[PDB]
Design a protein around this ligand. Sequence first.
Ligand SMILES: *[C@@H]1O[C@H](CO)[C@@H](O[C@@H]2O[C@H](CO)[C@@H](O[C@@H]3O[C@H](CO[C@H]4O[C@H](CO)[C@@H](O)[C@H](O)[C@@H]4O[C@@H]4O[C@H](CO)[C@@H](O[C@@H]5O[C@H](CO)[C@H](O)[C@H](O)[C@H]5O)[C@H](O)[C@H]4NC(C)=O)[C@@H](O)[C@H](O[C@H]4O[C@H](CO)[C@@H](O)[C@H](O)[C@@H]4O[C@H]4O[C@H](CO)[C@@H](O)[C@H](O)[C@@H]4O)[C@@H]3O)[C@H](O)[C@H]2NC(C)=O)[C@H](O)[C@H]1NC(C)=O
Ligand SMILES: *[C@@H]1O[C@H](CO)[C@@H](O[C@@H]2O[C@H](CO)[C@@H](O[C@@H]3O[C@H](CO[C@H]4O[C@H](CO)[C@@H](O)[C@H](O[C@H]5O[C@H](CO)[C@@H](O)[C@H](O)[C@@H]5O)[C@@H]4O)[C@@H](O)[C@H](O[C@H]4O[C@H](CO)[C@@H](O)[C@H](O)[C@@H]4O)[C@@H]3O)[C@H](O)[C@H]2NC(C)=O)[C@H](O)[C@H]1NC(C)=O
Ligand SMILES: *[C@@H]1O[C@H](CO)[C@@H](O)[C@H](O)[C@H]1NC(C)=O
Lengths: 107, 127, 53
Amino acid sequence: AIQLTQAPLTVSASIGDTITLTCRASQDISIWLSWYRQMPGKAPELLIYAASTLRGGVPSRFSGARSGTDFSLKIKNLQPEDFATYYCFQSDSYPRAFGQGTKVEIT
Amino acid sequence: QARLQQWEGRPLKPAETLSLTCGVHGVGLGGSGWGWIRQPPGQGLQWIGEIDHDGSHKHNPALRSRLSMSLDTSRNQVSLRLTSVTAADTAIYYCVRVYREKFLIGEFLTDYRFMDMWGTGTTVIVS
Amino acid sequence: RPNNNTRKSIRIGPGQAFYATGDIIGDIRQAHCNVSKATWNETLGKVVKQLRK
Ligand SMILES: *[C@@H]1O[C@H](CO)[C@@H](O[C@@H]2O[C@H](CO)[C@@H](O[C@@H]3O[C@H](CO[C@H]4O[C@H](CO)[C@@H](O)[C@H](O)[C@@H]4O[C@@H]4O[C@H](CO)[C@@H](O[C@@H]5O[C@H](CO)[C@H](O)[C@H](O)[C@H]5O)[C@H](O)[C@H]4NC(C)=O)[C@@H](O)[C@H](O[C@H]4O[C@H](CO)[C@@H](O)[C@H](O)[C@@H]4O[C@H]4O[C@H](CO)[C@@H](O)[C@H](O)[C@@H]4O)[C@@H]3O)[C@H](O)[C@H]2NC(C)=O)[C@H](O)[C@H]1NC(C)=O
Ligand SMILES: *[C@@H]1O[C@H](CO)[C@@H](O[C@@H]2O[C@H](CO)[C@@H](O[C@@H]3O[C@H](CO[C@H]4O[C@H](CO)[C@@H](O)[C@H](O[C@H]5O[C@H](CO)[C@@H](O)[C@H](O)[C@@H]5O)[C@@H]4O)[C@@H](O)[C@H](O[C@H]4O[C@H](CO)[C@@H](O)[C@H](O)[C@@H]4O)[C@@H]3O)[C@H](O)[C@H]2NC(C)=O)[C@H](O)[C@H]1NC(C)=O
Ligand SMILES: *[C@@H]1O[C@H](CO)[C@@H](O)[C@H](O)[C@H]1NC(C)=O
């Protein structure tokens, strides 16, 4: 199977900052890696698919990059609704896997 | 208005059958694929299994032979029938739609599945 | 034909099915045939030699 490593497991920033989240894969999964955000108590929602494409309705602040192993997600102009747990999900090999989850909070 | 609704199944006794059902409204079971995602408390999400557009059943290796899913095309419902439930299976179960978008790498066309639409949550507790 | 074709079945009548291309994925290069350039050149050389007679 493929293991996705997401670090740092807890990043803290105040409102109006820029954060970069890392999701490192085991093998090369091409660009097939989608990002999901889970607000505490709610259900996860799709932010980015194919590591670069923004979901319909997601603000332009969210953005991903890279098509190799070290996938990254960048958030600009932090707002209280962005302080949730983010997950990276690969779709290359049929034993699908999720990331560990990066809990973004306020300082 | 397209939503996936699933209802609580109440706590269940250990070593039984876990019957889940997701209600698909706004869209229909055809064309996409439908899978199940869980989340143990204080932990990350875990993939259980999916049925792809072809009607083919991808299952997680960890849950061996205790997995079985079906699609109710007439009622637009997705079912899960996990058996021999152990205390470690206490998690919130989500029903998802793995949607296929074709992304063109330099010369190769792929069906990319990206779980477009998520359920609301069914807290399953066994004791 | 590098494409990974996906045949799809349509029931056009009682017992009759129509097989249709539902989707095409994979390598989308145009269908082609490869003939070795060295082997073909020496084969036309033999054809030309027997054709000048
Ligand atoms: C060759 O041409 C073909 C066309 O001739 C191409 O095929 C088409 O490809 C389209 C793009 O892939 C695809 O559109 C997608 O459809 C999604 C819905 O799926 C449909 O259509 C299927 C057709 O087979 C049906 O089988 C499904 O059942 C479903 O139709 C439902 O059916 C219901 C009846 O069963 C209707 O009635 C509802 O029933 C409920 C029952 O409880 C309730 O009663 C409801 O009240 C009742 O309305 C539904 O009305 C109907 N729904 C329809 C028509 O939508 C659709 O979700 C996809 O769009 C969304 O997702 C993409 C990706 O995110 C976004 O880009 C879009 O913007 C849109 O997103 C938005 O919504 C989602 C939620 O859905 C949000 O998550 C998101 O944030 C956005 O807000 C998309 O439209 C076509 O369906 C398909 N058509 C056919 C004939 O297959 C073919 O690809 C092409 N081939 C090649 C090789 O080029
Ligand atoms: C090209 O594109 C095609 C799709 O058009 C790809 O074909 C599909 O491949 C996937 C795997 O990559 C298959 O999924 C698996 O399903 C098997 C069991 O499948 C059986 O049942 C299917 C549903 O009826 C059936 O379609 C299967 O195929 C037969 O029938 C088709 C016609 O419908 C015929 O064309 C075929 O030749 C077959 O006769 C088959 O009977 C399942 O065991 C697989 O394993 C997963 O799940 C297990 C647990 O169950 C898990 O342990 C594994 O790790 C894994 O997750 C998986 O579900 C899919 O069935 C194929 N679909 C079709 C239509 O054949 C093809 O691979 C692509 N090729 C290339 C070159 O990329
Ligand atoms: C044709 O394919 C065979 C293998 O199938 C290969 O050995 C051979 O070199 C190929 N020749 C050409 C002209 O493509």
